Symmetry: C3
Subunit: 217 residues, 3 copies
Protein backbone atom coordinates (compact mmCIF):
# COMPACT_ATOMS: atom_id res chain seq x y z
CA UNK A 1 0.00 0.00 0.00
CA UNK A 2 1.48 3.31 -1.15
CA UNK A 3 2.58 5.72 1.55
CA UNK A 4 0.12 8.59 2.00
CA UNK A 5 1.46 11.78 3.58
CA UNK A 6 -1.35 13.52 5.45
CA UNK A 7 -1.40 17.29 4.92
CA UNK A 8 -1.56 19.67 7.90
CA UNK A 9 -3.90 22.20 6.29
CA UNK A 10 -3.41 24.80 9.03
CA UNK A 11 0.37 24.62 8.44
CA UNK A 12 0.36 24.70 4.62
CA UNK A 13 1.39 27.81 2.75
CA UNK A 14 -1.37 26.95 0.24
CA UNK A 15 -4.14 26.98 2.86
CA UNK A 16 -5.79 30.15 1.55
CA UNK A 17 -5.65 29.29 -2.14
CA UNK A 18 -6.54 25.64 -1.47
CA UNK A 19 -9.72 26.55 0.43
CA UNK A 20 -10.55 29.33 -2.05
CA UNK A 21 -10.68 27.07 -5.11
CA UNK A 22 -12.20 24.20 -3.13
CA UNK A 23 -15.19 26.41 -2.34
CA UNK A 24 -15.32 27.62 -5.95
CA UNK A 25 -14.85 24.00 -7.15
CA UNK A 26 -12.40 25.20 -9.77
CA UNK A 27 -10.52 22.98 -12.21
CA UNK A 28 -9.06 23.94 -15.58
CA UNK A 29 -8.09 22.08 -18.72
CA UNK A 30 -5.13 23.28 -20.77
CA UNK A 31 -4.48 21.74 -24.19
CA UNK A 32 -1.32 21.96 -26.24
CA UNK A 33 0.79 19.90 -28.64
CA UNK A 34 4.00 18.15 -27.57
CA UNK A 35 6.78 17.74 -30.14
CA UNK A 36 7.40 13.98 -29.89
CA UNK A 37 9.71 13.75 -32.92
CA UNK A 38 12.78 12.73 -30.92
CA UNK A 39 10.82 10.41 -28.63
CA UNK A 40 9.11 8.63 -31.51
CA UNK A 41 12.32 8.15 -33.50
CA UNK A 42 13.94 6.65 -30.41
CA UNK A 43 11.13 4.24 -29.57
CA UNK A 44 11.06 3.17 -33.23
CA UNK A 45 14.83 2.59 -33.21
CA UNK A 46 14.43 0.32 -30.15
CA UNK A 47 11.29 -1.43 -31.36
CA UNK A 48 9.31 -0.32 -28.31
CA UNK A 49 5.59 0.32 -28.58
CA UNK A 50 4.86 4.02 -28.20
CA UNK A 51 1.91 3.93 -25.79
CA UNK A 52 3.67 2.30 -22.78
CA UNK A 53 6.67 4.58 -23.31
CA UNK A 54 4.29 7.53 -23.10
CA UNK A 55 2.51 6.11 -20.04
CA UNK A 56 5.89 5.74 -18.31
CA UNK A 57 6.88 9.28 -19.31
CA UNK A 58 3.68 10.84 -17.98
CA UNK A 59 4.00 8.87 -14.74
CA UNK A 60 7.56 10.16 -14.27
CA UNK A 61 6.33 13.74 -14.56
CA UNK A 62 3.44 13.06 -12.18
CA UNK A 63 5.94 11.65 -9.68
CA UNK A 64 8.25 14.67 -10.00
CA UNK A 65 6.06 17.12 -8.02
CA UNK A 66 3.71 16.62 -5.08
CA UNK A 67 1.20 19.07 -6.60
CA UNK A 68 0.39 16.29 -9.09
CA UNK A 69 -0.22 13.72 -6.30
CA UNK A 70 -2.45 15.54 -3.80
CA UNK A 71 -5.95 14.29 -3.08
CA UNK A 72 -8.37 12.83 -0.57
CA UNK A 73 -7.96 9.18 0.36
CA UNK A 74 -10.93 6.86 0.81
CA UNK A 75 -11.35 8.01 4.43
CA UNK A 76 -11.70 11.62 3.28
CA UNK A 77 -8.24 12.63 4.51
CA UNK A 78 -6.25 15.22 2.57
CA UNK A 79 -2.68 14.30 1.69
CA UNK A 80 -0.28 13.37 -1.07
CA UNK A 81 1.06 9.98 -2.13
CA UNK A 82 4.76 9.33 -2.63
CA UNK A 83 4.04 7.99 -6.14
CA UNK A 84 1.00 7.49 -8.35
CA UNK A 85 0.33 4.61 -10.74
CA UNK A 86 -1.29 5.19 -14.16
CA UNK A 87 -4.87 4.09 -14.78
CA UNK A 88 -4.80 4.02 -18.57
CA UNK A 89 -7.10 3.19 -21.47
CA UNK A 90 -7.02 -0.12 -23.31
CA UNK A 91 -9.16 -1.03 -26.30
CA UNK A 92 -11.03 -4.14 -27.44
CA UNK A 93 -11.15 -3.93 -31.22
CA UNK A 94 -13.84 -6.62 -31.33
CA UNK A 95 -16.51 -5.49 -28.88
CA UNK A 96 -15.52 -1.92 -29.74
CA UNK A 97 -15.24 -0.91 -26.12
CA UNK A 98 -12.50 0.35 -23.83
CA UNK A 99 -11.41 -0.47 -20.30
CA UNK A 100 -9.26 1.20 -17.70
CA UNK A 101 -6.44 -0.78 -16.10
CA UNK A 102 -3.47 0.16 -13.94
CA UNK A 103 0.11 -1.11 -13.90
CA UNK A 104 2.68 -0.14 -11.25
CA UNK A 105 5.71 1.91 -12.26
CA UNK A 106 8.32 0.87 -9.71
CA UNK A 107 11.69 1.54 -11.39
CA UNK A 108 13.03 1.31 -14.95
CA UNK A 109 11.09 1.35 -18.20
CA UNK A 110 11.76 -2.25 -19.24
CA UNK A 111 10.35 -3.56 -15.94
CA UNK A 112 7.20 -1.51 -16.45
CA UNK A 113 6.96 -2.41 -20.15
CA UNK A 114 6.91 -6.14 -19.42
CA UNK A 115 4.15 -5.70 -16.82
CA UNK A 116 2.17 -3.45 -19.14
CA UNK A 117 2.35 -6.11 -21.85
CA UNK A 118 1.16 -8.91 -19.56
CA UNK A 119 -1.56 -6.72 -18.00
CA UNK A 120 -2.95 -5.87 -21.45
CA UNK A 121 -3.04 -9.56 -22.40
CA UNK A 122 -4.69 -10.56 -19.11
CA UNK A 123 -7.32 -7.84 -18.80
CA UNK A 124 -8.36 -6.78 -22.30
CA UNK A 125 -11.60 -7.98 -23.83
CA UNK A 126 -13.38 -8.48 -20.52
CA UNK A 127 -16.55 -6.47 -21.08
CA UNK A 128 -15.92 -4.73 -17.74
CA UNK A 129 -15.04 -1.04 -17.48
CA UNK A 130 -12.52 -1.82 -14.71
CA UNK A 131 -11.44 -5.47 -15.09
CA UNK A 132 -8.40 -5.12 -12.77
CA UNK A 133 -9.60 -4.37 -9.23
CA UNK A 134 -9.22 -3.09 -6.64
CA UNK A 135 -7.78 0.03 -8.26
CA UNK A 136 -5.12 1.60 -6.00
CA UNK A 137 -6.03 4.93 -4.46
CA UNK A 138 -2.72 6.41 -5.68
CA UNK A 139 -3.75 6.42 -9.33
CA UNK A 140 -4.25 9.06 -12.02
CA UNK A 141 -6.30 8.74 -15.21
CA UNK A 142 -4.48 8.72 -18.58
CA UNK A 143 -6.83 8.45 -21.56
CA UNK A 144 -6.00 8.25 -25.24
CA UNK A 145 -8.14 9.14 -28.24
CA UNK A 146 -6.05 7.61 -31.06
CA UNK A 147 -8.72 8.09 -33.76
CA UNK A 148 -8.61 11.86 -34.04
CA UNK A 149 -6.29 14.70 -33.23
CA UNK A 150 -7.48 17.73 -31.31
CA UNK A 151 -6.40 21.22 -30.32
CA UNK A 152 -8.84 21.51 -27.42
CA UNK A 153 -10.25 18.96 -24.99
CA UNK A 154 -12.22 19.52 -21.79
CA UNK A 155 -14.08 17.23 -19.41
CA UNK A 156 -17.26 18.61 -17.83
CA UNK A 157 -17.60 16.48 -14.71
CA UNK A 158 -20.44 17.90 -12.62
CA UNK A 159 -20.25 15.24 -9.88
CA UNK A 160 -20.51 17.15 -6.56
CA UNK A 161 -16.91 16.28 -5.65
CA UNK A 162 -13.54 17.98 -5.31
CA UNK A 163 -11.36 15.37 -6.99
CA UNK A 164 -7.88 16.85 -6.81
CA UNK A 165 -5.68 14.59 -8.95
CA UNK A 166 -4.56 15.38 -12.52
CA UNK A 167 -6.48 14.05 -15.52
CA UNK A 168 -4.55 13.51 -18.77
CA UNK A 169 -5.90 12.98 -22.29
CA UNK A 170 -3.81 12.47 -25.43
CA UNK A 171 -4.89 12.50 -29.06
CA UNK A 172 -3.84 11.15 -32.43
CA UNK A 173 -0.45 12.22 -33.72
CA UNK A 174 -0.28 15.22 -36.06
CA UNK A 175 2.44 14.94 -38.72
CA UNK A 176 3.98 18.14 -40.14
CA UNK A 177 6.78 17.06 -42.47
CA UNK A 178 9.52 15.52 -40.33
CA UNK A 179 7.87 16.60 -37.07
CA UNK A 180 5.36 14.59 -35.07
CA UNK A 181 3.11 16.31 -32.54
CA UNK A 182 1.02 14.79 -29.77
CA UNK A 183 -2.20 16.55 -28.72
CA UNK A 184 -2.18 16.62 -24.93
CA UNK A 185 -4.74 17.98 -22.47
CA UNK A 186 -4.03 18.39 -18.75
CA UNK A 187 -7.00 18.92 -16.42
CA UNK A 188 -6.10 19.86 -12.85
CA UNK A 189 -7.73 21.26 -9.73
CA UNK A 190 -6.68 24.82 -8.95
CA UNK A 191 -6.67 24.09 -5.21
CA UNK A 192 -3.44 22.14 -5.78
CA UNK A 193 -2.22 23.09 -9.29
CA UNK A 194 -1.73 26.67 -10.51
CA UNK A 195 -0.94 27.76 -14.04
CA UNK A 196 2.66 27.38 -12.92
CA UNK A 197 2.25 23.67 -12.18
CA UNK A 198 0.43 23.17 -15.48
CA UNK A 199 3.41 24.75 -17.24
CA UNK A 200 5.76 22.59 -15.22
CA UNK A 201 3.82 19.53 -16.37
CA UNK A 202 3.85 20.36 -20.09
CA UNK A 203 7.44 21.61 -20.10
CA UNK A 204 8.58 18.47 -18.25
CA UNK A 205 6.74 16.24 -20.75
CA UNK A 206 8.48 18.06 -23.60
CA UNK A 207 11.92 18.02 -21.97
CA UNK A 208 11.74 14.30 -21.19
CA UNK A 209 10.39 13.51 -24.66
CA UNK A 210 13.47 15.19 -26.12
CA UNK A 211 15.87 13.24 -23.84
CA UNK A 212 14.71 9.61 -24.11
CA UNK A 213 18.26 8.32 -23.52
CA UNK A 214 17.79 9.58 -19.93
CA UNK A 215 14.85 7.43 -18.82
CA UNK A 216 13.78 5.09 -21.61
CA UNK A 217 17.07 3.58 -22.78
CA UNK B 1 -43.53 12.18 -35.10
CA UNK B 2 -40.09 10.56 -35.32
CA UNK B 3 -39.84 6.95 -34.20
CA UNK B 4 -38.23 6.62 -30.76
CA UNK B 5 -36.65 3.26 -29.93
CA UNK B 6 -36.84 2.70 -26.18
CA UNK B 7 -33.64 1.28 -24.70
CA UNK B 8 -33.73 -1.82 -22.46
CA UNK B 9 -31.06 -0.65 -20.02
CA UNK B 10 -30.76 -4.04 -18.31
CA UNK B 11 -30.07 -5.63 -21.73
CA UNK B 12 -27.59 -3.06 -23.07
CA UNK B 13 -23.90 -3.85 -23.26
CA UNK B 14 -23.29 -0.21 -22.26
CA UNK B 15 -25.26 -0.48 -19.01
CA UNK B 16 -22.21 -0.21 -16.76
CA UNK B 17 -20.50 2.64 -18.58
CA UNK B 18 -23.81 4.43 -19.18
CA UNK B 19 -24.71 4.46 -15.47
CA UNK B 20 -21.11 5.26 -14.48
CA UNK B 21 -20.90 8.51 -16.46
CA UNK B 22 -24.53 9.38 -15.73
CA UNK B 23 -23.71 9.42 -12.01
CA UNK B 24 -20.50 11.37 -12.69
CA UNK B 25 -22.45 13.67 -15.08
CA UNK B 26 -19.57 13.53 -17.54
CA UNK B 27 -19.49 15.22 -20.93
CA UNK B 28 -16.44 16.25 -22.94
CA UNK B 29 -15.75 18.76 -25.69
CA UNK B 30 -13.17 17.95 -28.36
CA UNK B 31 -12.10 20.66 -30.80
CA UNK B 32 -10.25 20.21 -34.06
CA UNK B 33 -10.04 21.67 -37.56
CA UNK B 34 -11.68 20.02 -40.58
CA UNK B 35 -10.03 20.43 -43.99
CA UNK B 36 -12.98 21.74 -46.03
CA UNK B 37 -10.95 22.64 -49.14
CA UNK B 38 -12.64 20.07 -51.38
CA UNK B 39 -16.10 20.71 -49.93
CA UNK B 40 -15.83 24.47 -50.34
CA UNK B 41 -14.55 24.29 -53.91
CA UNK B 42 -17.46 22.02 -54.79
CA UNK B 43 -20.17 24.16 -53.20
CA UNK B 44 -18.67 27.20 -54.93
CA UNK B 45 -18.67 25.39 -58.29
CA UNK B 46 -22.39 24.62 -57.82
CA UNK B 47 -23.34 28.02 -56.42
CA UNK B 48 -24.66 26.50 -53.20
CA UNK B 49 -24.45 28.42 -49.95
CA UNK B 50 -21.95 26.78 -47.61
CA UNK B 51 -23.91 26.81 -44.34
CA UNK B 52 -26.85 24.57 -45.40
CA UNK B 53 -24.42 22.18 -47.10
CA UNK B 54 -22.59 21.93 -43.78
CA UNK B 55 -25.82 21.51 -41.81
CA UNK B 56 -26.80 18.65 -44.13
CA UNK B 57 -23.35 17.07 -43.79
CA UNK B 58 -23.39 17.18 -39.99
CA UNK B 59 -26.91 15.75 -39.93
CA UNK B 60 -25.80 12.85 -42.14
CA UNK B 61 -23.03 12.00 -39.69
CA UNK B 62 -25.41 12.29 -36.73
CA UNK B 63 -27.78 9.90 -38.50
CA UNK B 64 -25.00 7.38 -39.21
CA UNK B 65 -24.65 6.06 -35.64
CA UNK B 66 -27.18 5.59 -32.84
CA UNK B 67 -24.65 6.83 -30.26
CA UNK B 68 -25.28 10.31 -31.70
CA UNK B 69 -29.08 9.99 -31.29
CA UNK B 70 -29.55 8.64 -27.75
CA UNK B 71 -31.38 10.68 -25.14
CA UNK B 72 -34.37 11.00 -22.86
CA UNK B 73 -37.70 11.90 -24.44
CA UNK B 74 -40.11 14.35 -22.82
CA UNK B 75 -41.58 11.56 -20.67
CA UNK B 76 -38.14 10.79 -19.24
CA UNK B 77 -37.74 7.57 -21.21
CA UNK B 78 -34.29 6.54 -22.45
CA UNK B 79 -34.01 5.62 -26.10
CA UNK B 80 -32.68 6.62 -29.49
CA UNK B 81 -34.43 8.24 -32.45
CA UNK B 82 -34.17 6.86 -35.97
CA UNK B 83 -33.05 10.29 -37.22
CA UNK B 84 -32.38 13.71 -35.73
CA UNK B 85 -33.14 17.10 -37.28
CA UNK B 86 -30.72 20.04 -36.94
CA UNK B 87 -31.59 22.97 -34.68
CA UNK B 88 -29.22 25.55 -36.14
CA UNK B 89 -28.29 29.18 -35.65
CA UNK B 90 -29.63 31.99 -37.81
CA UNK B 91 -28.68 35.65 -37.52
CA UNK B 92 -30.56 38.95 -37.73
CA UNK B 93 -28.00 41.50 -38.92
CA UNK B 94 -30.30 44.35 -37.89
CA UNK B 95 -31.31 43.60 -34.32
CA UNK B 96 -27.93 41.92 -33.90
CA UNK B 97 -29.43 38.81 -32.39
CA UNK B 98 -29.60 35.14 -33.27
CA UNK B 99 -32.33 32.53 -33.25
CA UNK B 100 -32.47 28.77 -33.36
CA UNK B 101 -34.65 27.08 -35.96
CA UNK B 102 -34.95 23.51 -37.23
CA UNK B 103 -35.52 22.13 -40.71
CA UNK B 104 -36.16 18.44 -41.46
CA UNK B 105 -33.59 16.47 -43.44
CA UNK B 106 -35.70 13.80 -45.13
CA UNK B 107 -33.72 12.77 -48.22
CA UNK B 108 -31.47 14.56 -50.72
CA UNK B 109 -29.60 17.82 -50.28
CA UNK B 110 -31.61 19.90 -52.76
CA UNK B 111 -34.87 19.06 -50.97
CA UNK B 112 -33.36 20.16 -47.67
CA UNK B 113 -31.72 23.24 -49.20
CA UNK B 114 -35.04 24.57 -50.51
CA UNK B 115 -36.68 24.10 -47.10
CA UNK B 116 -33.73 25.70 -45.33
CA UNK B 117 -34.01 28.72 -47.61
CA UNK B 118 -37.75 29.17 -47.00
CA UNK B 119 -37.39 28.55 -43.25
CA UNK B 120 -34.72 31.25 -42.98
CA UNK B 121 -36.94 33.73 -44.84
CA UNK B 122 -39.98 32.88 -42.72
CA UNK B 123 -38.42 32.80 -39.26
CA UNK B 124 -35.52 35.25 -39.21
CA UNK B 125 -35.84 38.66 -37.62
CA UNK B 126 -38.54 37.62 -35.16
CA UNK B 127 -37.03 38.79 -31.87
CA UNK B 128 -37.75 35.32 -30.42
CA UNK B 129 -34.99 32.88 -29.47
CA UNK B 130 -37.05 29.98 -30.88
CA UNK B 131 -39.47 31.40 -33.49
CA UNK B 132 -40.31 27.98 -35.00
CA UNK B 133 -42.13 25.87 -32.41
CA UNK B 134 -42.75 23.28 -31.23
CA UNK B 135 -39.17 22.08 -31.66
CA UNK B 136 -39.10 18.32 -32.36
CA UNK B 137 -37.65 16.17 -29.61
CA UNK B 138 -35.35 14.46 -32.15
CA UNK B 139 -33.14 17.51 -32.62
CA UNK B 140 -29.49 18.35 -32.05
CA UNK B 141 -27.94 21.80 -31.65
CA UNK B 142 -25.60 23.11 -34.38
CA UNK B 143 -24.19 26.56 -33.64
CA UNK B 144 -21.91 28.71 -35.75
CA UNK B 145 -19.57 31.50 -34.69
CA UNK B 146 -18.69 33.01 -38.10
CA UNK B 147 -16.93 36.09 -36.67
CA UNK B 148 -13.87 34.41 -35.23
CA UNK B 149 -11.94 31.21 -35.63
CA UNK B 150 -10.99 29.09 -32.64
CA UNK B 151 -8.83 26.14 -31.67
CA UNK B 152 -10.74 25.38 -28.47
CA UNK B 153 -14.40 25.72 -27.52
CA UNK B 154 -16.24 24.35 -24.50
CA UNK B 155 -19.72 24.86 -23.08
CA UNK B 156 -20.05 24.87 -19.29
CA UNK B 157 -23.70 23.97 -18.79
CA UNK B 158 -24.28 23.42 -15.07
CA UNK B 159 -28.03 22.72 -15.39
CA UNK B 160 -28.72 19.69 -13.14
CA UNK B 161 -29.53 17.51 -16.16
CA UNK B 162 -28.05 14.60 -18.09
CA UNK B 163 -28.71 15.80 -21.63
CA UNK B 164 -27.28 13.05 -23.80
CA UNK B 165 -27.38 14.38 -27.37
CA UNK B 166 -24.38 15.81 -29.25
CA UNK B 167 -23.72 19.56 -29.32
CA UNK B 168 -21.84 20.97 -32.33
CA UNK B 169 -20.16 24.36 -32.72
CA UNK B 170 -18.31 25.60 -35.80
CA UNK B 171 -16.10 28.65 -36.21
CA UNK B 172 -14.86 31.02 -38.89
CA UNK B 173 -12.82 29.52 -41.69
CA UNK B 174 -9.03 29.57 -41.39
CA UNK B 175 -7.22 30.02 -44.72
CA UNK B 176 -3.70 28.59 -45.13
CA UNK B 177 -2.71 29.16 -48.76
CA UNK B 178 -4.92 26.94 -50.91
CA UNK B 179 -6.36 25.10 -47.90
CA UNK B 180 -9.46 26.09 -45.96
CA UNK B 181 -10.03 24.78 -42.44
CA UNK B 182 -13.20 24.77 -40.37
CA UNK B 183 -12.90 24.98 -36.57
CA UNK B 184 -15.26 22.36 -35.18
CA UNK B 185 -16.09 21.44 -31.58
CA UNK B 186 -18.06 18.32 -30.65
CA UNK B 187 -19.49 18.11 -27.12
CA UNK B 188 -20.94 14.73 -26.15
CA UNK B 189 -22.05 12.83 -23.08
CA UNK B 190 -19.71 10.00 -22.13
CA UNK B 191 -22.64 7.80 -21.09
CA UNK B 192 -23.38 7.35 -24.81
CA UNK B 193 -20.27 8.60 -26.68
CA UNK B 194 -16.71 7.45 -25.98
CA UNK B 195 -13.54 8.89 -27.45
CA UNK B 196 -14.11 6.32 -30.18
CA UNK B 197 -17.46 7.83 -31.17
CA UNK B 198 -15.96 11.33 -31.08
CA UNK B 199 -13.28 10.13 -33.49
CA UNK B 200 -15.94 8.49 -35.64
CA UNK B 201 -17.77 11.82 -35.77
CA UNK B 202 -14.77 13.94 -36.79
CA UNK B 203 -13.38 11.37 -39.22
CA UNK B 204 -16.81 10.99 -40.84
CA UNK B 205 -17.15 14.78 -41.20
CA UNK B 206 -13.74 14.88 -42.88
CA UNK B 207 -14.39 11.90 -45.15
CA UNK B 208 -17.75 13.26 -46.32
CA UNK B 209 -16.31 16.75 -46.80
CA UNK B 210 -13.73 15.24 -49.15
CA UNK B 211 -16.38 13.30 -51.15
CA UNK B 212 -19.12 15.87 -51.86
CA UNK B 213 -20.05 14.14 -55.13
CA UNK B 214 -21.43 11.34 -52.90
CA UNK B 215 -24.13 13.25 -50.99
CA UNK B 216 -24.27 16.86 -52.13
CA UNK B 217 -24.28 16.57 -55.92
CA UNK C 1 -17.10 54.21 -6.63
CA UNK C 2 -17.79 53.25 -10.25
CA UNK C 3 -21.23 54.09 -11.61
CA UNK C 4 -23.47 51.02 -11.83
CA UNK C 5 -26.37 51.20 -14.29
CA UNK C 6 -29.21 49.02 -13.01
CA UNK C 7 -30.85 46.93 -15.73
CA UNK C 8 -34.65 46.95 -16.17
CA UNK C 9 -34.99 43.26 -16.99
CA UNK C 10 -38.63 43.56 -18.08
CA UNK C 11 -37.58 46.27 -20.57
CA UNK C 12 -34.48 44.58 -22.01
CA UNK C 13 -34.52 43.05 -25.47
CA UNK C 14 -32.31 40.29 -24.03
CA UNK C 15 -34.82 39.28 -21.34
CA UNK C 16 -35.68 35.94 -22.93
CA UNK C 17 -32.13 34.87 -23.77
CA UNK C 18 -30.79 36.23 -20.48
CA UNK C 19 -33.23 34.19 -18.38
CA UNK C 20 -32.82 31.15 -20.65
CA UNK C 21 -29.06 30.82 -20.14
CA UNK C 22 -29.30 31.90 -16.50
CA UNK C 23 -31.52 28.89 -15.81
CA UNK C 24 -29.22 26.65 -17.87
CA UNK C 25 -26.18 28.24 -16.14
CA UNK C 26 -24.38 28.40 -19.46
CA UNK C 27 -20.93 29.85 -20.03
CA UNK C 28 -18.50 29.04 -22.83
CA UNK C 29 -14.76 29.32 -23.32
CA UNK C 30 -13.38 30.12 -26.77
CA UNK C 31 -9.63 29.88 -27.37
CA UNK C 32 -7.68 31.30 -30.27
CA UNK C 33 -4.31 32.87 -31.09
CA UNK C 34 -3.85 36.62 -31.54
CA UNK C 35 -1.17 37.83 -33.96
CA UNK C 36 0.77 40.22 -31.70
CA UNK C 37 3.68 40.79 -34.12
CA UNK C 38 2.95 44.48 -34.65
CA UNK C 39 2.10 45.09 -30.99
CA UNK C 40 5.26 43.41 -29.74
CA UNK C 41 7.54 45.22 -32.17
CA UNK C 42 6.02 48.52 -31.06
CA UNK C 43 6.32 47.90 -27.32
CA UNK C 44 9.92 46.78 -27.88
CA UNK C 45 10.68 49.95 -29.87
CA UNK C 46 9.34 52.05 -26.96
CA UNK C 47 10.94 49.98 -24.21
CA UNK C 48 7.57 49.25 -22.60
CA UNK C 49 7.00 45.99 -20.77
CA UNK C 50 4.56 43.82 -22.69
CA UNK C 51 2.27 42.65 -19.88
CA UNK C 52 0.89 46.07 -18.80
CA UNK C 53 0.43 47.04 -22.45
CA UNK C 54 -1.66 43.89 -22.87
CA UNK C 55 -3.62 44.53 -19.66
CA UNK C 56 -4.44 48.03 -20.93
CA UNK C 57 -5.44 46.66 -24.34
CA UNK C 58 -7.78 44.04 -22.88
CA UNK C 59 -9.33 46.63 -20.57
CA UNK C 60 -10.01 48.92 -23.54
CA UNK C 61 -11.89 46.14 -25.31
CA UNK C 62 -13.83 45.29 -22.14
CA UNK C 63 -14.81 48.95 -21.85
CA UNK C 64 -15.94 49.12 -25.50
CA UNK C 65 -19.18 47.13 -25.06
CA UNK C 66 -21.62 46.84 -22.16
CA UNK C 67 -22.01 43.09 -22.78
CA UNK C 68 -18.51 42.74 -21.27
CA UNK C 69 -19.48 44.71 -18.13
CA UNK C 70 -22.82 43.21 -17.04
CA UNK C 71 -23.13 41.46 -13.70
CA UNK C 72 -24.70 41.40 -10.26
CA UNK C 73 -23.40 43.87 -7.70
CA UNK C 74 -22.85 42.92 -4.07
CA UNK C 75 -26.52 43.60 -3.27
CA UNK C 76 -27.60 41.11 -5.92
CA UNK C 77 -28.76 43.78 -8.36
CA UNK C 78 -28.35 43.22 -12.10
CA UNK C 79 -26.69 46.00 -14.06
CA UNK C 80 -23.62 47.10 -15.95
CA UNK C 81 -20.71 49.29 -14.88
CA UNK C 82 -19.50 52.21 -16.97
CA UNK C 83 -15.95 50.79 -16.87
CA UNK C 84 -14.21 47.76 -15.40
CA UNK C 85 -10.73 47.61 -13.88
CA UNK C 86 -8.41 44.62 -14.49
CA UNK C 87 -7.72 42.15 -11.68
CA UNK C 88 -4.54 40.60 -13.06
CA UNK C 89 -1.97 38.00 -12.08
CA UNK C 90 1.38 38.86 -10.55
CA UNK C 91 4.10 36.37 -9.65
CA UNK C 92 6.53 35.96 -6.75
CA UNK C 93 9.53 34.13 -8.19
CA UNK C 94 10.78 33.32 -4.69
CA UNK C 95 7.81 31.81 -2.88
CA UNK C 96 6.68 30.47 -6.25
CA UNK C 97 3.16 31.76 -5.80
CA UNK C 98 0.90 34.23 -7.57
CA UNK C 99 -1.43 36.98 -6.43
CA UNK C 100 -4.24 38.94 -7.98
CA UNK C 101 -4.14 42.73 -7.85
CA UNK C 102 -6.09 45.48 -9.60
CA UNK C 103 -4.99 48.83 -10.99
CA UNK C 104 -7.41 51.47 -12.33
CA UNK C 105 -7.34 52.35 -16.02
CA UNK C 106 -8.56 55.95 -16.04
CA UNK C 107 -7.15 57.47 -19.24
CA UNK C 108 -3.92 57.07 -21.23
CA UNK C 109 -1.49 54.17 -21.21
CA UNK C 110 1.43 55.96 -19.56
CA UNK C 111 -0.73 56.94 -16.57
CA UNK C 112 -1.82 53.33 -16.15
CA UNK C 113 1.70 51.98 -16.73
CA UNK C 114 3.15 54.07 -13.88
CA UNK C 115 0.43 52.87 -11.49
CA UNK C 116 0.88 49.27 -12.61
CA UNK C 117 4.60 49.52 -11.89
CA UNK C 118 4.10 50.95 -8.40
CA UNK C 119 1.29 48.49 -7.59
CA UNK C 120 3.50 45.54 -8.54
CA UNK C 121 6.31 46.84 -6.31
CA UNK C 122 3.95 47.47 -3.39
CA UNK C 123 1.88 44.30 -3.46
CA UNK C 124 4.06 41.49 -4.79
CA UNK C 125 5.61 38.93 -2.47
CA UNK C 126 2.93 39.24 0.21
CA UNK C 127 1.91 35.61 0.65
CA UNK C 128 -1.74 36.69 0.28
CA UNK C 129 -3.88 35.70 -2.71
CA UNK C 130 -5.43 39.19 -2.77
CA UNK C 131 -2.99 41.61 -1.11
CA UNK C 132 -4.73 44.76 -2.44
CA UNK C 133 -8.20 45.01 -0.90
CA UNK C 134 -11.01 45.80 -1.08
CA UNK C 135 -11.22 44.70 -4.71
CA UNK C 136 -13.63 46.95 -6.65
CA UNK C 137 -16.85 45.31 -7.78
CA UNK C 138 -16.27 46.60 -11.33
CA UNK C 139 -13.38 44.23 -12.01
CA UNK C 140 -12.67 41.42 -14.46
CA UNK C 141 -10.10 38.63 -14.10
CA UNK C 142 -7.09 38.58 -16.46
CA UNK C 143 -4.76 35.63 -15.87
CA UNK C 144 -1.51 34.78 -17.60
CA UNK C 145 0.23 31.42 -17.93
CA UNK C 146 3.65 32.53 -19.24
CA UNK C 147 5.30 29.10 -18.85
CA UNK C 148 3.46 27.24 -21.59
CA UNK C 149 1.50 28.00 -24.70
CA UNK C 150 -1.89 26.46 -25.32
CA UNK C 151 -4.51 26.03 -28.02
CA UNK C 152 -7.35 25.27 -25.61
CA UNK C 153 -8.12 26.48 -22.10
CA UNK C 154 -11.31 26.09 -20.07
CA UNK C 155 -12.23 26.80 -16.46
CA UNK C 156 -14.68 24.39 -14.81
CA UNK C 157 -16.12 26.50 -12.00
CA UNK C 158 -18.97 24.55 -10.41
CA UNK C 159 -19.75 27.16 -7.73
CA UNK C 160 -23.57 27.47 -7.65
CA UNK C 161 -23.41 31.03 -9.02
CA UNK C 162 -24.23 32.93 -12.20
CA UNK C 163 -21.14 35.13 -12.42
CA UNK C 164 -21.69 37.14 -15.57
CA UNK C 165 -18.42 38.99 -16.21
CA UNK C 166 -15.77 37.92 -18.76
CA UNK C 167 -12.79 35.81 -17.72
CA UNK C 168 -9.58 36.13 -19.75
CA UNK C 169 -6.54 33.84 -19.81
CA UNK C 170 -3.42 34.33 -21.93
CA UNK C 171 -0.57 31.92 -22.58
CA UNK C 172 3.09 31.92 -23.55
CA UNK C 173 3.97 33.43 -26.91
CA UNK C 174 4.27 31.11 -29.91
CA UNK C 175 6.94 32.17 -32.41
CA UNK C 176 6.54 31.19 -36.09
CA UNK C 177 9.39 32.84 -37.98
CA UNK C 178 8.80 36.60 -37.89
CA UNK C 179 5.32 36.22 -36.40
CA UNK C 180 4.47 36.14 -32.71
CA UNK C 181 1.16 34.69 -31.53
CA UNK C 182 -0.54 35.02 -28.16
CA UNK C 183 -2.76 32.17 -26.93
CA UNK C 184 -5.93 33.79 -25.61
CA UNK C 185 -9.01 32.24 -24.02
CA UNK C 186 -12.22 34.19 -23.40
CA UNK C 187 -14.80 32.67 -21.03
CA UNK C 188 -18.16 34.44 -20.95
CA UNK C 189 -21.69 33.87 -19.73
CA UNK C 190 -24.17 33.30 -22.54
CA UNK C 191 -26.86 35.27 -20.69
CA UNK C 192 -24.93 38.43 -21.62
CA UNK C 193 -22.42 37.38 -24.32
CA UNK C 194 -23.32 35.50 -27.51
CA UNK C 195 -20.91 34.06 -30.04
CA UNK C 196 -21.20 37.47 -31.67
CA UNK C 197 -19.81 39.27 -28.61
CA UNK C 198 -17.03 36.70 -28.31
CA UNK C 199 -16.09 37.44 -31.92
CA UNK C 200 -16.29 41.15 -31.20
CA UNK C 201 -13.88 40.65 -28.30
CA UNK C 202 -11.26 38.67 -30.24
CA UNK C 203 -11.51 40.80 -33.37
CA UNK C 204 -11.18 43.98 -31.29
CA UNK C 205 -8.10 42.58 -29.51
CA UNK C 206 -6.55 41.80 -32.89
CA UNK C 207 -7.46 45.14 -34.46
CA UNK C 208 -6.08 47.13 -31.53
CA UNK C 209 -2.94 44.98 -31.39
CA UNK C 210 -2.29 45.89 -35.02
CA UNK C 211 -2.81 49.64 -34.39
CA UNK C 212 -0.73 50.40 -31.28
CA UNK C 213 -0.08 53.98 -32.44
CA UNK C 214 -3.79 54.57 -31.70
CA UNK C 215 -3.88 53.83 -27.96
CA UNK C 216 -0.41 52.95 -26.70
CA UNK C 217 1.77 55.68 -28.19
CO1 LIG D 1 -17.42 22.86 -17.03
Amino acid sequence: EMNFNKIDLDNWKRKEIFNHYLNQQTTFSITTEIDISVLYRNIKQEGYKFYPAFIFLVTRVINSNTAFRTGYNSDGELGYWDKLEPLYTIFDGVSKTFSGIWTPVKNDFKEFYDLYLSDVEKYNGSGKLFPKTPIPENAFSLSIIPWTSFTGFNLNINNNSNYLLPIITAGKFINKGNSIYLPLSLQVHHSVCDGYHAGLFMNSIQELSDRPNDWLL
